[PDB]
Amino acid sequence: SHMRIVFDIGGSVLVPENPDIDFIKEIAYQLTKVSEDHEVAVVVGGGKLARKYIEVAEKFNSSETFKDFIGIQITRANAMLLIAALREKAYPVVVEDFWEAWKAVQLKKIPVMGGTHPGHTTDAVAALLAEFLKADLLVVITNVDGVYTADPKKDPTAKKIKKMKPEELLEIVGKSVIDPLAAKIIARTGIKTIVIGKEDAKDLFRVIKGDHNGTTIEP
Amino acid sequence: HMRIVFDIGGSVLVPENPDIDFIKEIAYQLTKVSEDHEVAVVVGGGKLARKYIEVAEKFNSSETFKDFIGIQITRANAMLLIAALREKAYPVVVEDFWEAWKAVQLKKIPVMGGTHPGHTTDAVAALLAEFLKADLLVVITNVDGVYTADTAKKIKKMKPEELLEIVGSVIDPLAAKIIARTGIKTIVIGKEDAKDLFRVIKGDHNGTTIEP
Amino acid sequence: SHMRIVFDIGGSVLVPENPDIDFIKEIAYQLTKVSEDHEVAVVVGGGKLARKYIEVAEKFNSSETFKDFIGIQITRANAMLLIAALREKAYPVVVEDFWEAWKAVQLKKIPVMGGTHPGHTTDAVAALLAEFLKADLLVVITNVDGVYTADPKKDPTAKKIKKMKPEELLEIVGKSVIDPLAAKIIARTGIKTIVIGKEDAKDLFRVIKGDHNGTTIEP
Amino acid sequence: HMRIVFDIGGSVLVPENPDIDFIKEIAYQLTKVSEDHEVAVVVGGGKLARKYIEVAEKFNSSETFKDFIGIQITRANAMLLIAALREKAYPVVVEDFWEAWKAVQLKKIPVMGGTHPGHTTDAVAALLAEFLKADLLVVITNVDGVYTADTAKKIKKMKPEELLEIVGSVIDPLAAKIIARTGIKTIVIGKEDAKDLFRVIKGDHNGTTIEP
Amino acid sequence: HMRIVFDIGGSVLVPENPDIDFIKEIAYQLTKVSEDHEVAVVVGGGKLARKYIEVAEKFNSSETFKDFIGIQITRANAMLLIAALREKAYPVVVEDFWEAWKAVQLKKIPVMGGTHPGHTTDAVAALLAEFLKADLLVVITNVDGVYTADTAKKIKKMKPEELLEIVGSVIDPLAAKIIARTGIKTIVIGKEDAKDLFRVIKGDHNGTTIEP
Amino acid sequence: SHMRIVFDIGGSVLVPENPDIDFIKEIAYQLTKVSEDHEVAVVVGGGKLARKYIEVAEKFNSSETFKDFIGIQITRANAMLLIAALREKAYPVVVEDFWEAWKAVQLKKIPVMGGTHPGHTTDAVAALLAEFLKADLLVVITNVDGVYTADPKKDPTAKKIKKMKPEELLEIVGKSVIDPLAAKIIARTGIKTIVIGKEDAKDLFRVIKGDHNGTTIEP
Numbered sequence A, C, F: 001s002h003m004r005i006v007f008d009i010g011g012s013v014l015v016p017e018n019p020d021i022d023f024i025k026e027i028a029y030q031l032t033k034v035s036e037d038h039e040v041a042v043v044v045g046g047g048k049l050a051r052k053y054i055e056v057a058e059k060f061n062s063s064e065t066f067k068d069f070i071g072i073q074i075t076r077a078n079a080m081l082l083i084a085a086l087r088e089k090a091y092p093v094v095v096e097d098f099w100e101a102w103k104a105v106q107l108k109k110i111p112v113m114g115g116t117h118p119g120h121t122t123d124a125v126a127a128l129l130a131e132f133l134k135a136d137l138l139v140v141i142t143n144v145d146g147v148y149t150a151d152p153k154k155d156p157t158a159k160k161i162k163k164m165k166p167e168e169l170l171e172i173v174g175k176s177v178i179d180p181l182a183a184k185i186i187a188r189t190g191i192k193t194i195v196i197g198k199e200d201a202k203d204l205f206r207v208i209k210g211d212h213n214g215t216t217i218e219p
Numbered sequence B, D, E: 001h002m003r004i005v006f007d008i009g010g011s012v013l014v015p016e017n018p019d020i021d022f023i024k025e026i027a028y029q030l031t032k033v034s035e036d037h038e039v040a041v042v043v044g045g046g047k048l049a050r051k052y053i054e055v056a057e058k059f060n061s062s063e064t065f066k067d068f069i070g071i072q073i074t075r076a077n078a079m080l081l082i083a084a085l086r087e088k089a090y091p092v093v094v095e096d097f098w099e100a101w102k103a104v105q106l107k108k109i110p111v112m113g114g115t116h117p118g119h120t121t122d123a124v125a126a127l128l129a130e131f132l133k134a135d136l137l138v139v140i141t142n143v144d145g146v147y148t149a150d151t152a153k154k155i156k157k158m159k160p161e162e163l164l165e166i167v168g169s170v171i172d173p174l175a176a177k178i179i180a181r182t183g184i185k186t187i188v189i190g191k192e193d194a195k196d197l198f199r200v201i202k203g204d205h206n207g208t209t210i211e212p
């Protein structure tokens, strides 16, 4: 059993306020173990640091495009922290485009990406990566349990949906755990996607076998 | 007086093959418009991009790689406009926004093609309009304007919000999101009205005006 | 027997009017088989699409240099179609310079090039590639049988010359199957070159053993 | 009349978090100064760069990779200034000297961050001042000026040679070497004097003036 | 009034070592010429490039890699001219044509070296003249002009066609092909006439004039 | 015993007047042998050619920065001569940044660097490379025997110090075989450094075992 997996690590999980060192350390260990039997690629988000800086740029009335560029820039500094945690198993530099990630995987090294272009999120970056690498699996480690019928941190009636088809995720994301564009990419290619939180992330070996309490999305 | 971004649909510039005289005309008009305003242009892929994408589809290429092929074709198309724009154009096809910005500083018309998988040239033009803080975004597509359907009806004016509903193709969602998020005044016209850009940018057109 | 081979696939063969899907598919299979025992690199031309677009640029009186750039751009879109046909065996992106092709070969992947610079053709690109990689063989798959004393599609007395030395090819190309610069490169390094048409291209395994009806050029 | 290079310490722009109003002010003043002189700016990393560097340290990352992380953070900081500088700034963060040179030709303020492992933004600003043959180099750090120690004393004026001794941190050695090697007139002031750049560049300041 | 491209032979700029005063002079004249015309320059490799190429030859390096070494040396030589051209030169060595184009827009003299294996700086200058639609191409080589042989004879005027025959070295074939294909007015002079470029570009010279 | 080694080959040794072909040939052989058992990376300096060209730029009163750029440019032409001598064992192009050197080492090829940035020397480039690659050893082959208490080509009392700690080298370089910045890098990471001349360079196998008459610097 040898699969190719893309992990989309949410910026808020990686950097809630300041970088969460314990989680970085722990997820790096997990990723490292999984990389022993599978080809692993990674995309990380911006988190609190990205929101601070973007908010500063907002006070100077900068364009929404320049603000995206700032967030992207912050996601790459974050990606560097994971690369550091992955030690010798990581590709040494933040990967900025898909074919470069492909190369890293050829060299049996783990490529870690940050954002790529204005208009979308690292979620979209992760989906396109998975699509490009023809990954068997896309694992989204976010700050919520899985996919709910409503925002679980707010709406009391929010119920978790264990399994859905890409179309379901599209409805839900429109009515969000995942960004729309990312949702469209997952739906156009039929990328098998798992959405889990920090708890399940503690054991990626089990997660990739389907043993988790998150949400599984597939055609 | 104005900073304008023109989004020329691929099917309009290259219906089957390249529409020679139309390219000559749009190039000429774009030139006149640039004497009075700052011009930037993004060109689509058209039928040619679909042919090449279909070929890759036959080899079960991933959707991401197909996007890259379409992008490559949109740049080939852009080179045709750059050629028609002669000395008033920025020599090479622009691949990123600040590059378009440098061209504007040099008083040269930058012509972009696509940029990244996942979206279309509309998104490119939208993000370009937004990056440059353009006053106007002109979308020249294969449809007469924005209809309430594919017996539909054409909506003269509407707000960014209403544009997001309708798109739920005429314009891709990402592009509609960029337009709403920033409130970019946008005009959607067909090949017919594109035959007189000079007047189109002054309200004289029978297309659709999307504005906050 | 492990050789390093550079294949120069003519644009007119790859795209006679529209892309010739059957030939692309077939040559990709052949290239794939040859790559099992040898290191394969590929360069492709522009064809009909390149002539259309270049001709459009001519109507706008653009420089001959800008027109070359357009042809190059079209050859890269063509190269992408072959990359697609080569599937997992191909280097994912159009290679734009020789050392990048070298890398692809290091990764046991097939690099596919398009044009590189104004002033010459993909033939020259292929010759320089072969020279750079120190290839044992340069195979030119064009739209003619091999090298003739005159244009075979026109002159009735055109006779095919089975074997010649680089000097011969130079005379012939001056008095063309191959572009002059490409001819000069083949002559300065003494690159063993085979010139065949579509028919012989159906079996590259046989072609590289010398079993073909084309022309062989070597010192 | 003058070509000036400003070196803004990371701790000054980002003490803990970004100092909003200070950024607004320095951005405003830099803008006024640019009406009369050619301006170029290099921004440091501050506390944020140290946090991120410390994290990498915890994973025993090499010193070279830590330098790369600090550099990445200095560019994030530079984007904040570029934002505050609005349309008078060069859009992207400048990564090499001739790039800064192009920005100057375009009458836009280039804002650089770090560039290479082994040194700091002071060296970047010094080499930038030198590359551009700038008339003045203004160093805005967290210290009042150049003291004979960390009861030390502040030295009003001194020569490049004497600056090399003192640094044997206020300013990194490589930067001091570049300043001496070329004889770049340099002014070292603190956050206090930075509150009125317009006068600082005219001698009115209580910092240190290093000059041959 | 005119857009001119100068092709300075490597042996002329670097006979054995760099010809200091000659570089100073050609740099000075190029500067004067640029006050009245748009100037672009391409520099060769000379004896130095041959030394380095010969060394690689000793290790049986491929001809392609030798070309890359010669190219690298031609850029080293170009940096010497850029240095002599001072503030009127584009800071970095130009590696591609549109880059030279940007320099021209900035009113700075771009100085290119070689660009691709397979040809020489003559081809680079020819393609540059062609890309820029230059009115004149001035070739400064080690020979007095274009002779009917290596008792030969010098041909005052000739047409592109006749230049292609003669080259079948003074000028490389690719360059001759570019000159003919486009009909670039070309002047071929030696180090002697290069001592007064200002007059050379006005017909006053005893070299050869290749023109359609 | 498999170590990772960075060799800093002084420009004056590689090019004393004109390129020293015999030394290039000989050191390439040595480097090639060492690369059979270890991961080898290389940085080379400018030498006489770099000083000539820099001096020409001085006569035109160019900035010290532009002069550095010229020296860097010359070091890369020099690096190409070594690459040529290393034949098939070398990475085909002059490496310009550390992660690219990392890649070359992944491909079991020898990367050869020239200068990288204004302000320092190839010595600093070598030290940062070693630091980046986490090399076990940095070997400096310069034009002097090892580290002396004074300039050995001038001061009669110059005595060679066989062993010292990074702090020692810092004092000495301040009061130079090695450039200050390079010295600071060696001291901040504690890079084990050996400083030898041409004589000892004739047998790198012995040098890396500690059998040499040069200077060894380590914490």
Ligand SMILES: O=c1ccn([C@@H]2O[C@H](COP(=O)(O)OP(=O)(O)OP(=O)(O)O)[C@@H](O)[C@H]2O)c(=O)[nH]1
Pocket (backbone or CB within 6 Å): A010, A011, A012, A044, A045, A046, A047, A048, A050, A051, A067, A068, A069, A070, A071, A072, A075, A114, A115, A116, A117, A118, A119, A120, A121, A122, A123, A125, A179
């Ligand atoms: O490819 C990319 C990545 C990131 N970004 C920009 O950087 C920011 C961070 O990128 P994230 O991927 O973390 O965005 P998110 O919106 O899902 O972030 P949170 O709300 O959960 O904090 C986003 O706000 C986006 O604008 C891009 O523009 N493009």
Ligand SMILES: O=c1ccn([C@@H]2O[C@H](COP(=O)(O)OP(=O)(O)OP(=O)(O)O)[C@@H](O)[C@H]2O)c(=O)[nH]1
Pocket (backbone or CB within 6 Å): B009, B010, B011, B043, B044, B045, B046, B047, B049, B050, B053, B066, B067, B068, B069, B070, B071, B074, B113, B114, B115, B116, B117, B118, B119, B120, B121, B122, B124
């Ligand atoms: O930024 C871009 C631009 C273009 N493309 C890719 O290139 C192709 C052409 O890009 P277009 O912008 O022309 O697409 P369109 O689908 O809107 O085209 P028509 O249907 O009217 O014919 C599209 O199919 C898209 O996938 C990208 O992936 N990214």
Ligand SMILES: O=c1ccn([C@@H]2O[C@H](COP(=O)(O)OP(=O)(O)OP(=O)(O)O)[C@@H](O)[C@H]2O)c(=O)[nH]1
Pocket (backbone or CB within 6 Å): C010, C011, C012, C044, C045, C046, C047, C048, C050, C051, C067, C068, C069, C070, C071, C072, C075, C114, C115, C116, C117, C118, C119, C120, C121, C122, C123, C125, C179
């Ligand atoms: O490296 C390159 C490749 C291609 N090109 C440019 O692109 C075009 C296509 O490149 P080809 O290699 O297909 O040219 P060809 O001349 O042998 O083409 P046909 O006549 O057989 O159709 C050529 O016309 C050339 O100008 C370059 O300028 N440089």
Ligand SMILES: O=c1ccn([C@@H]2O[C@H](COP(=O)(O)OP(=O)(O)OP(=O)(O)O)[C@@H](O)[C@H]2O)c(=O)[nH]1
Pocket (backbone or CB within 6 Å): D009, D010, D011, D043, D044, D045, D046, D047, D049, D050, D053, D066, D067, D068, D069, D070, D071, D074, D113, D114, D115, D116, D117, D118, D119, D120, D121, D122, D124
């Ligand atoms: O060119 C550069 C710039 C910066 N950096 C790296 O980025 C970091 C921040 O770069 P700074 O220029 O802010 O460093 P500083 O150490 O002088 O910072 P403070 O102590 O006052 O907080 C530094 O730690 C340095 O290693 C480089 O490696 N190279």
Ligand SMILES: O=c1ccn([C@@H]2O[C@H](COP(=O)(O)OP(=O)(O)OP(=O)(O)O)[C@@H](O)[C@H]2O)c(=O)[nH]1
Pocket (backbone or CB within 6 Å): E009, E010, E011, E043, E044, E045, E046, E047, E049, E050, E053, E066, E067, E068, E069, E070, E071, E074, E113, E114, E115, E116, E117, E118, E119, E120, E121, E122, E124
């Ligand atoms: O674009 C270029 C330029 C130069 N070169 C390579 O660099 C070298 C120097 O480039 P030159 O343009 O000086 O060559 P030249 O041969 O005409 O030189 P001389 O004989 O008069 O001494 C040449 O030997 C060539 O191979 C290229 O390969 N491509």
Ligand SMILES: O=c1ccn([C@@H]2O[C@H](COP(=O)(O)OP(=O)(O)OP(=O)(O)O)[C@@H](O)[C@H]2O)c(=O)[nH]1
Pocket (backbone or CB within 6 Å): F010, F011, F012, F044, F045, F046, F047, F048, F050, F051, F067, F068, F069, F070, F071, F072, F075, F114, F115, F116, F117, F118, F119, F120, F121, F122, F123, F125, F179
């Ligand atoms: O990374 C680099 C490398 C080199 N250089 C520049 O190129 C030149 C050659 O680089 P070297 O590394 O050979 O300098 P060196 O000072 O130790 O040279 P010698 O005195 O022994 O001859 C140096 O003078 C330097 O200015 C840089 O600026 N940066």
